[PDB]
Amino acid sequence: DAWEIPRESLRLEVKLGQGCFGEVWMGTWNGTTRVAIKTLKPMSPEAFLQEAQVMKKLRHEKLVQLYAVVSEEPIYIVTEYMSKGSLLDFLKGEMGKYLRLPQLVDMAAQIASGMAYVERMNYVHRDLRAANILVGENLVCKVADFGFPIKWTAPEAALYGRFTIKSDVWSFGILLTELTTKGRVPYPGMVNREVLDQVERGYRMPCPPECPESLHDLMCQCWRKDPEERPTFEYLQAFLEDYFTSTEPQYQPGENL
Numbered sequence: 001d002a003w004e005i006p007r008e009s010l011r012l013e014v015k016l017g018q019g020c021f022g023e024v025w026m027g028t029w030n031g032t033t034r035v036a037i038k039t040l041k042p043m044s045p046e047a048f049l050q051e052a053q054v055m056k057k058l059r060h061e062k063l064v065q066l067y068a069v070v071s072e073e074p075i076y077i078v079t080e081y082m083s084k085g086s087l088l089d090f091l092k093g094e095m096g097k098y099l100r101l102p103q104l105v106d107m108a109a110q111i112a113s114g115m116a117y118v119e120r121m122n123y124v125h126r127d128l129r130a131a132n133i134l135v136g137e138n139l140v141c142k143v144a145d146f147g148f149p150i151k152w153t154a155p156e157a158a159l160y161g162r163f164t165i166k167s168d169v170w171s172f173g174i175l176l177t178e179l180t181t182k183g184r185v186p187y188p189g190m191v192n193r194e195v196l197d198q199v200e201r202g203y204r205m206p207c208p209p210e211c212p213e214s215l216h217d218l219m220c221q222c223w224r225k226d227p228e229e230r231p232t233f234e235y236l237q238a239f240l241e242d243y244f245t246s247t248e249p250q251y252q253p254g255e256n257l
């Protein structure tokens with residue numbers, strides 16, 4: 001591939017994360033370029049490289065960009081560096097307190113835009129969640145982790161393994177509650193089985209405090225029982241972009257949103 005780089009052109013400076021497959025470092029590439037670096041802790045090599053095999057085919061400003069690879073053990077996947085790390089940490093940290101609806105709606109729209117690309121390219125994420133969204137300067141968000149947590153997963157997908165772009169739309173509705181509670185785990189107080197039993201019976205999370213009903217109505221569309229009645233990402237993107245003129249032209253900031 002043209003993606004391949006020499007091992008000595010990489011310097012891993014700061015560990016950012018660790019996990020059951022390996023780790024993520026902040027580093028440099030060709031002594032000039034800030035980069036995120038992912039390692040395979042010697043998962044199968046074929047298994048771990050599938051992510052970059054995908055990120056080679058998908059280019060878009062709201063998807064984290066692959067830069068380079070090292071395809072022999074030890075493996076290295078090199079992408080653009082996102083300075084604020086996961087959206088989940090972002091919302092839960094010192095910035096969460098300063099975010100209001102216009103910022104969060106904007107981030108949602110950026111994500112929707114990324115997912116609209118995925119929709120058009122005919123892929124399926126299957127783990128779309130705030131913990132898998134990355135954030136950079138000036139509130140840029142990007143879809144990441146193209147490598148199942150029940151609370152984020154559509155019923156048909158969790159029960160019958162029917163994973164589609166429509167089950168990603170379902171996750172997006174959950175991710176909207178994460179944006180509007182600023183990182184809270186969805187379905188507060190409920191364990192997995194209780195979530196699954198309840199969602200099947202037609203339970204849906206209620207409108208989060210200070211969140212406008214019009215936004216909770218959007219979540220509710222993403223959580224329709226019939227996958228094909230859920231809106232497209234193109235639709236969601238357009239709605240979120242237009243939100244403050246078309247839907248809440250008289251919105252006022254509150255204490256939290």
Ligand SMILES: Nc1ncnc2c1c(-c1cnc3[nH]ccc3c1)nn2C1CCCC1
Nearest residue numbers: 016017024036038080081082085086144145
């Ligand atoms: N690109 C990044 N920039 C800044 N921080 C990043 C990341 C990633 C990250 C996310 N997805 C990835 N896929 C391949 C490498 C890779 C690295 N992960 N992380 C942190 C690791 C804990 C969550 C955020």
